[PDB]
Amino acid sequence: DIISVALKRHSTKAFDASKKLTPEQAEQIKTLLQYSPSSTNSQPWHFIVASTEEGKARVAKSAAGNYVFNERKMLDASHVVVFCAKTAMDDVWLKLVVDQEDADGRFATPEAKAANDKGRKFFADMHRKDLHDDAEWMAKQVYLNVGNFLLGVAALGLDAVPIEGFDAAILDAEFGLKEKGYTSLVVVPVGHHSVEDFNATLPKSRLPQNITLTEV
Template identity: 60%
Template sequence: MNIVQNAKTRYSTKAFNPTKKLSEEHVQAVKDLIRMSPSSVNSQPWHFIVASTEEGKERIAKATQGGFEFNTRKILDASHVVVFAAKTSIDEQYLLELLESETQAGRFDNEESKQGMHGGRSFFVNMHRFDLKDANHWMEKQVYLNVGTLLLGASSLGLDAVPIEGFNAKVLDEEFGLREQGYTSAVIVPLGYRSEDDFNAALPKSRWDESQVFTEC
């Protein structure tokens, strides 16, 4: 199955089979997909919680109480659950640490190219920090790029998944001390294998017609 077919056949899983678990190879592949996701100017403003134990999933599911109970079973029955968290601030120290990470990876041939990268990235980051004043929104956009990478990648691995925004971020942040670490939860993605009772698996996909969503010139 090619990647286009994966896009056509993947769907948001509404019920997982709690008896089927991801292999270690699939778990590592999921981590690789997440870590290698693109982000604007390679900013990588994120952190992830990966829960595979019943205790870990129950901690995440606490955030579905009080109005989002329809998502509880998805989290508890999935094999693994990933919490996507976005940074709450981005500063010069972070940019320098990121630059050093890239240096260690061998991305720069010389000091000039290194400083060129730092200057270019700082321009865009500071534009969002000081001029547009939307740095938090901008960083969350990068997290959503990552979610898209995981959803399509998971489908290519034969895994089922669903992105969840229906949860109490304050509860989840407090459960894992995310805000104290400089992050806030944005999306929860349970992964595993669909249940035979998943009504959404048999429904046809529905998308706008090409004529409505494309302008070709």
């Protein structure tokens, strides 16, 4: 059951570089990235999946400075996902989303379709025009993607670790993300843990629900 998975998964601190995702698992992790929900189906994200040694090493350059303890996880894991958010929400993206909803069969009439576009545009506008927080808003959708992904990959039997400990300016410049409209937020190596993963035998710790949760 999924609760066992939630209780047994852990942040892997070191990966076995000789254990690769199966071809089928490599497909499945891309499916998880794609099929996450997002506010208005805005999907304001891009993913880089590095599985070559070259491409992981490029991503690993971002694990410099204070963040070297993360470098080896990025090099040793089978696949390394970089989760990136759009830096602004443009009308071309909003059109592409609704056209795709349309191509996929979600609208019965042109009017249903126009209403969807109008509603997405309205709610998007509150972030990009009124509140000026559309960067933050899109980044949140991407973290939601991450949350989905980590539970997903745990349920496939894979090890993983989310990493904020890396230099986004480096990683952005390494892949040309600013000029393309994106910024890197979280890196998630996926694979199988090695013997150096001290975190695999430690008990899980969370605050008690009497602190964090209220029922009404």
